[PDB]
Write a protein that binds this ligand. Structure first.
Ligand SMILES: Cc1nc(-c2ccc(C(=O)Nc3cc(S(N)(=O)=O)cc(C)c3C)cc2)cs1
Ligand SMILES: Nc1ncnc2c1ncn2[C@@H]1O[C@H](COP(=O)(O)OP(=O)(O)O)[C@@H](O)[C@H]1O
Ligand SMILES: [Zn+2]
Length: 516
DNA sequence: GTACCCGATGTGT
């Protein structure tokens, strides 16, 4: 149905193009931009799946300028709100916000401006919690609704509705109030990451029963995906070495599971002279802003070692590697966090250090949810299971796994082979370490069993177990994994007399270990 | 037996 929306003959088109050229300073629309903008200006509810950097902002900022009245944009972070409103005001588009960082007097001025006969402000940025606490905001929105000057409700990063609306920031659910208070006002949700289940969840929680859907390919052509086995007490040195070998002059992020993990990573990297800085909620906002500016400018900070708190507002185009020192809580989270790499389209690396012993820590973190119930927990456990299944899948192409998770099917299976420069690890000693480790565990169990049976025989005859078979002979018997006497006599220290005396008890379960 | 342990915002007089 996008053919009807791909038209430059609408009544709003002329003014739209005027603002697009003179106010935004652009020249050509990108993929799905014009269609989504037309659909928005036609009053339709919109759901936009567009990659980061694809141009989501314009899709709601141009209609906000064209439509009469105020467009209310709900954003999850005060940082995102201030950043976007600053960019808009620098572009000379009337926009303002009402968050916890504005003083009461400027808020009163904003309400008075909204109360004027002509509301100059086109974009009003708010948080979900502000909508669920300010009665003054609700009354102002009602005033705007009565004069038909409440344009849009925009949900920027709509996946957050499904990510924290059920158990952390329940106002993201409780904000459904707007659809009851202002049912005729259209809604537009934008996101870069959403599998079909989260898509349906976003649409149901936002009370959007018939949206126009604008989607694109989830493929990230320029990213090479890696997952490596993690040594929990050496991981810092491993990642640091990898960075030094592959990205000595490249900016990067190391995502960590805990605050102490971030501090340990930063300490190691600083101890060997890598400009790495820790970033998590434990730091003050003063220190957080300082480190963020240090990383963005590459001035004394090459790698930032951060928790999931960092990243949502960052638009650095030349991030060449993203390291997850521990596996993330979900595949959606992994896609979003690793996608912070390679916004410029150049080849980048996504390195994930995997252990299930971190899955246990993530399960502990999940069970430590203040407002979690049986269902929300169960959903998080399933997400973690899907992440572990991705980590342990050493057979399927990682791009195919990611695209199947998001429901994109018509994808070329030979992509990783046609363009090997951006190939995942699976498409490139790998599976041999398991073949060696299984044999080593087998010889360990065999040595234990042989030592125990020798101890039993020694207790029977009243001699130390070294006089039946010594340590080295038992170790050599374990390494053989055999049970044929003709080969046992080929082992140094094993004799025919000791065979004729102890063979029934020595072969014992050792004959059952012939499979390795 | 015990230490482990991410992440927002939020006001009319
Ligand atoms: C960093 C990022 N995280 C996400 C992300 C991860 C997981 C979910 C999710 O699974 N949410 C969900 C879905 C359902 S439901 N209705 O689909 O069954 C029910 C319940 C209770 C929850 C919590 C949503 C978003 C995207 S980017
Ligand atoms: N039609 C367009 N043509 C060229 N550049 C554009 C267009 N629309 C937006 N941009 C640019 O893209 C940049 C980022 O857009 P944004 O909407 O933030 O991307 P994302 O959707 O990934 O967040 C902005 O600096 C903007 O100037
Ligand atoms: Zn591949």
């Amino acid at each position: 149905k996008h053919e009807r929306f791909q038209s430059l003959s609408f009544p709003h088109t002329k003014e739209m193009m005027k603002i697009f050229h003179k106010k935004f300073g652009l020249h050509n629309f990108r993929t799905n931009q014009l269609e989504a903008i037309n659909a928005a200006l036609l009053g339709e509810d919109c759901f936009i799946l567009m990659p980061t950097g694809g141009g989501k902002s314009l899709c709601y900022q141009l209609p906000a300028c064209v439509s009469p009245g105020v467009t209310v944009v709900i954003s999850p972070l005060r940082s995102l709100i201030v950043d976007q409103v600053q960019k808009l005001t620098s572009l000379d588009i009337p926009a303002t916000y009402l968050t916890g960082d504005k003083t009461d007097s400027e808020a009163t001025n904003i309400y008075l401006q909204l109360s004027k006969k002509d509301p100059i402000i086109k974009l009003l940025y708010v948080t979900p919690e502000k909508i669920c606490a300010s009665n003054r905001l609700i009354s102002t929105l009602e005033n705007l609704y009565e004069r038909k000057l409440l344009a849009r409700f925009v949900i920027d990063e709509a996946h957050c509705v499904s990510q924290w609306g059920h158990d952390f920031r329940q106002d993201y659910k409780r904000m459904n109030m707007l659809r009851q208070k202002f049912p005729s006002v259209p809604v537009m949700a934008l996101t870069a990451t959403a599998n079909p289940r989260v898509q349906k969840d976003i649409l149901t929680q936002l009370k959007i029963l018939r949206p126009q859907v604008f989607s694109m390919s989830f493929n990230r052509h320029n990213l090479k995906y890696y997952v490596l086995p993690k040594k929990p007490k050496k991981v810092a040195f491993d990642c640091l070495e990898w960075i030094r070998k592959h990205h000595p002059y490249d900016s990067g992020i190391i995502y960590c599971l805990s605050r102490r993990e971030c501090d340990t990573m930063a300490d190691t990297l600083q101890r060997d002279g890598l400009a790495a800085l820790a970033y998590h909620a434990g730091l003050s906002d003063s220190a957080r802003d300082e480190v963020q500016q240090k990383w963005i400018n590459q001035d004394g900070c090459q790698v930032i070692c951060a928790t999931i708190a960092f990243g949502m507002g960052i638009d650095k185009p030349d991030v060449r590697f993203v390291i997850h020192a521990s596996l993330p809580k979900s595949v959606e989270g992994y896609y979003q966090e690793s996608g912070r790499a390679g916004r410029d389209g150049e080849i980048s690396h996504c390195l994930l250090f995997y252990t299930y012993h971190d899955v246990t820590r993530l399960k502990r973190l999940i069970m430590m949810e203040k407002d979690g119930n049986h269902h929300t927990r169960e959903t998080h456990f399933n997400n973690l299971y899907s992440m572990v299944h991705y980590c342990e899948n050493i057979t399927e192409c990682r791009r195919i796994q990611l695209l199947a998770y998001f429901g994109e099917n018509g994808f070329n299976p030979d992509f990783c082979k046609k363009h090997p420069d951006v190939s995942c690890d699976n498409c490139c000693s790998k599976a041999l370490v398991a073949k060696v480790s299984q044999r080593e565990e087998m010889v360990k169990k065999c040595l234990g069993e042989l030592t125990e049976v020798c101890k039993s025989l020694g207790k029977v005859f009243g001699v130390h177990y070294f006089n039946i078979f010594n340590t080295v002979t038992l170790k050599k018997l374990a390494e053989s994994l055999s049970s044929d006497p003709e080969v046992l006599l080929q082992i140094d220290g094993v004799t025919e007399d000791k065979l004729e005396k102890y063979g029934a008890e020595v072969i014992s379960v050792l004959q059952k270990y012939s499979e390795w």
